[model samples]
Target: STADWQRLDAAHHLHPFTDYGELNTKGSRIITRAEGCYLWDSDGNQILDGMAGLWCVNIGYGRKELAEVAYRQMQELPYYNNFFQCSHPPAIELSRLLSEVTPKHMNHVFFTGSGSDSNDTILRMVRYYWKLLGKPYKKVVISRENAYHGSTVAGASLSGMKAMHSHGDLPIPGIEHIEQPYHFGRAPDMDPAEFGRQAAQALERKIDEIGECNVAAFIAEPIQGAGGVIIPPDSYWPEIKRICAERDILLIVDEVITGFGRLGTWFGSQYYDLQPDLMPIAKGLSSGYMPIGGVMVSDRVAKVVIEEGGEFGHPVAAAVAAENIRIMRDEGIIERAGAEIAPYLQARWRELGEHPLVGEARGVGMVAALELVKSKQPLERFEEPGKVGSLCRDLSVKNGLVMRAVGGTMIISPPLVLSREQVDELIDKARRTLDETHKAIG
Candidate 1:
């Protein structure tokens, strides 16, 4: 049965960020169902869902409440177009709840089907926002290197990944990249705060090179999720904020990864205390139960845009999202997780950093990553990029946990509801996975 499912998937279903040739030859696991932080494969293996089904699933899997809401909503109204002054109860209620949950300045929302398109909508909105202000030339958006926006044409363009760029000849236009606020990857020998300030000044450098008049906004995640859980230093966000404030540019924080309680707060904006003009959100919005996302518009940005104009979620998803948020708030999933799980998880995660193969273990709130290296020093030489991490990821899955390999880094964004016991389980498996990888390489 596993073989049959694997064969069918290999034949028809194409996966993103995958080497299809290797996947097809080796076959992919058919995950039958998931609950809490664990998944059951077709072969009856109970593997931990460390990535939270592609970094969504905030409330964990198999929430009967969410499923029931979707089913009931489908029966009652099903599908309705949300354009042309036409809006439904679910859309209205979800919008209100989102405003309540997001930052104080951001009070309006424009829903989308997924996070990728949300960023695209943001691109258009940012351009339009500048145009309406009589400064149409300020359309260029600056982002950091290795930033993760989305996979859509505009999303991929906004994203800073070079390989994704190779596919589409991307970064379509008006998109500039500055150095990330990454420590281990860049300038590890320097004082972290100094390194952070220097990195932030790169924005200054870029704006100078691009001409400050042409730059409209600077976009980044408070904690970069997809590009190796890159957490900016203390000096990073504050300086970036000051620059945007004085330079008269809008700050667009891509909250697709750090939004909706992933970063121990409702949004990373609050966690970092940085106000953003536009925030693109998805993934954890509906906890991956249904596809729903939107852009949270600040009053400043919304004033011109909302006073001027701004999706249809097809109704069913809107209803689903409302219930998802309700469950999160009522159950205190984020609050409890931050108090109970995060400290232990972070402590244990850092312990793995001492492993000979691990270069660094870094994360914040509920997400983290550890880099697999031949040695721990800066500028350590390696051959064949991502190969070691790939071997470790394969070993991790077999070791009964799912850890994603991003280049030489193994990353995890587990569900907010993960138990203390399960954290131990995940850590043990991860250690063994690294040990197995060491032996395999030998």
Candidate 2:
């Protein structure tokens, strides 16, 4: 059965961000089952899932409650379009729940099918807001270099990855990027607070260059996720907020990876005390049980958008997402994650920096990154950037852990449901993998 699945996968399935030829040659490692924070492969290897199913799945796997809700919804009203000014109970209720969970000002939502679509929606919505205000010249959006928004045309353009840009003459136009606040990668020498100011000022410089009147918004993640968990300094966000307010541009925060109790708060915007004019969220919306995303619009923006409203909801996804929030709230899952598990996990994770191969260990809440190095004192690197991380990543899986290799950084975002015992096991497995990697490299 495993071979059958692999054959079918190789024959038809094209995995995301993968090299098809190389994977076909090696054969994909088929995941057959998952529970809590671990996954079982086709060969029956019990691997600890440190990445939380691509940084979603906050409630973990094998929750019958989610499945039961989906079943009930499907049996009742499985599919319905939100067009022609039609409305649905699921969508209506989910909107109320979202408003309760998100910031007080973010009471209105425009639902989309995925994070990418939500971002594309923001691109359209923000420009339209400015248009309604009669500032048609305010069209450009400012993002940060190495920030990841999503993968669609508009989403990819909002994202600042060069590889994604190389594919399609991308960025499509009207998007500008400032330097990211990646202290470890770029500004190891500067004081973190000072570096944060410098990073935020880049936005001001760019806005001035483009002329503030022409800029529609400044968008960023509270913590950069796919750009290797680049957590900014404490001074960064406040300064960014000030700049946006002074410049009079809309602030859009992409909480696709940091929403729904990931950062010990319901939303990262709340964590950073950012009052974004617009916020795009997905991932944990349904704990990956179903696909759904939406943009939380402030009252100012919502009033304008509602006046120009159109169909933006999917029936089943709305129901599933609403149930997901109910479970998170009623079960005290988010509260436990923020008040207990996150602090415990981060304390243990920060200890990894003491390992000989680890240059730095940094994290906030459940998401974290370990920077691999040749030497830790001066923070030296290997001759090749990605090779060591790739070796460590592959060996981590073999040694019973799943950690992501982003160049020289090894990242992890375990499920919010992970226990103290599971955290210990994860650290043990990671240490063993680091040992194996060191010996192999030597």
Candidate 3:
């Protein structure tokens, strides 16, 4: 029976971001099956996956076509490596499609197995690009505080998360920090637009402190996902763009959470109307059907590296990833996400603001956050960490809706393919969960 899975998990599973002792004692809610938006747990509890398997699975779960493709690929040639100049059709075609789908200037694609690895790949590639240019001193990278890039050594170092560094010594020597475009945390006197300008200046200040000559690049999510779905104030990216232009620094936009129609556009760069030198994307590329992540490089960076005596091509990773690109486009998933369904999702986010528990409901497209404050009037958090936020996450699970909490903020980024009705269901359940959490905390 499927109930056996929970037992097995308790006996052997070591889950990420889980307490091993607690998980071993209580086990996990083992998902037995999934189709479209519904997930059936081991105990026959049908759960709505509001987070879409960590904001991937855009085409929805239980697509037999995706499985069939994987089966065919495995049968044809599954284990081939991209090492030693060899290549495959999947990898070749994917790159071609990626260049067409990504932002205008970003024509080069370098692939990896996951978003974490993709970020690490970028760190290495950015440094290598500068080193090849004979300016190895350009190693310092600027990133916003509370940003979530990934989990790898260099990726974690570049990230602005405070909790992550507690486990490992981070903010690695080359990584420099700046303030985020979080309006909630901004100065009280400044409006959101003005606050954005102030936050962007933090980069200029960091560059000054680090010495412009030593700083090589700056990386940010077009919208912060894991750092509580923190959308930048409207003026944020434009100012960052100007600062990068003035400083002659490379801008690597972390789209691991914002790419592939999550923000009602093919890329968050388009959503925010700002260009990036390089963009790292994963999750929605194959909708989590396969393990694939990539860095889309701009013509400016490519010219310096590939056209002008620079090393290029990571053949193997690129080959397999090509197939994922084909499926996302040929299946009409991206088009539906950006054009048809995105508007519906945005309207639903606006509706969330009417709820008493909702302090703020903000996002573009499906990537959104519902901040739960102590009271909506003043927007205050609980006295202690994990008091309100932790209860919200627990109640969401109990109410059969999967969600995440970043302090007082509850974030959700469902699959782009979800219907308007399904999104409404998700919000309804979240509202109930909020009520239950409020009761529990009080």
Candidate 4:
């Protein structure tokens, strides 16, 4: 039955970012069910979800509360457009909850169907803001190299992934990517603090190059998530903020991955003490339960835009998001993770860096990465990137874990509901996978 299902999938399903030929030969692993942090595949193996279903599932899986809320909401008000001065209660409730969890300044939300859509909406919102102020020339957005905003035309344009760009001939226009504040990749030999300032100063350099008046905003994740969980250095954000303020450019903090307690804070902006004029939020907004996302507009942006905007609503998704938020608050999911699990997870994660195969083990809060290397002593890389990392990803699954591979880096962003025991299991599987990867690579 599983083989037949895989065959059907191969025949019809054009999986995103997947190699059809390779997948056809191997067959996709059919995930049958999930509960807590584990997914039961068609093979009957209970695999640990280390990546939290693409950095969502903040409330974990198989929560009846969220399911029931969605069902009831759908029956009552399945669909409604927040257009022409019409609004829904679920949207209002979700917005209220979002404001409670978000930074003080962000009070308004413009809902979209996903993170990709959120970025698209916000990109337009940014241009709209400048136009209203009679500065239509200020429409350029500065993102970072390798930063992943999303996959929509506008969203992909905002993102820095080259492979995505190659397909669509993207980064449509007015989007400039600067060097990411990835200290290890870009400036490993330099002091991290010094490198941090230097990296942040790139914003200043770019602003001057383009002339600040022509630039609309600088968009980036607080911690680069899809780009191998790149944690910017301590000195990075301060300098970035200073440059933004001095240059008078609006700051767009894209928190699709880092929002909803992934970074041990409600939002990445709060985690980094950022004062973003706009925030593209999703993924965690509905915890992968439903397709819902939005732009969290600060008072500054809302003041101008509130006087001009329309049409975006999702009753079911909004209701689920609000219930999920309530569940999170009631269970004290984030607070506990911040107080207990994050520290333990971080400590145990860093211990893995000692492995000869691991060139680096770095993370903050719940997200982390292990840099797979050829030789650690002299700090050498694999001749071909992604080869061993792919092997490790499959191996991790075989060993009952689901660590994702990004080139030669192994990434994880397990659910906040992960217990201490589950954490141990995850770590054990990871170490075992690393050992197997080493043997295979050798």
Clash number by candidate, in order: 0, 0, 3, 0
Give me the displacement of residue 259 in model 2, in angstroms. Answer: 0.6
Q: 1 or 4: which has the higher lDDT?
A: 4
Summarize candidate 4's per-residue lDDT along 132-172 as a digit string, tens digits. 88899999998899999988898788888877888756678
How many clashing residue pairs, candidate 2? 0
Off by over 4 Å in 4: 82-88, 308-312
Order the candidates by lDDT, highest first — what do you get?
2, 4, 1, 3
Instruction: List candidate 1 segments past 4 Å from native.
Output: 82-88, 308-312, 377-381
Full-model lDDT for every candidate: 0.85, 0.87, 0.78, 0.86
| Global Cα RMSD, each model | 2.1, 1.8, 2.5, 1.8
lDDT string for model 1 (13-51, tens) is: 999777789789988888898888899999999999889
Worst 10 residues of 2 by lDDT: 79-88
Cα RMSD for candidate 4?
1.8
Rank candidates by TM-score, best first: 4, 2, 1, 3
Off by over 4 Å in 3: 1-3, 79-88, 308-324
Cα distance off (Å), candidate 4, residue 361: 1.2
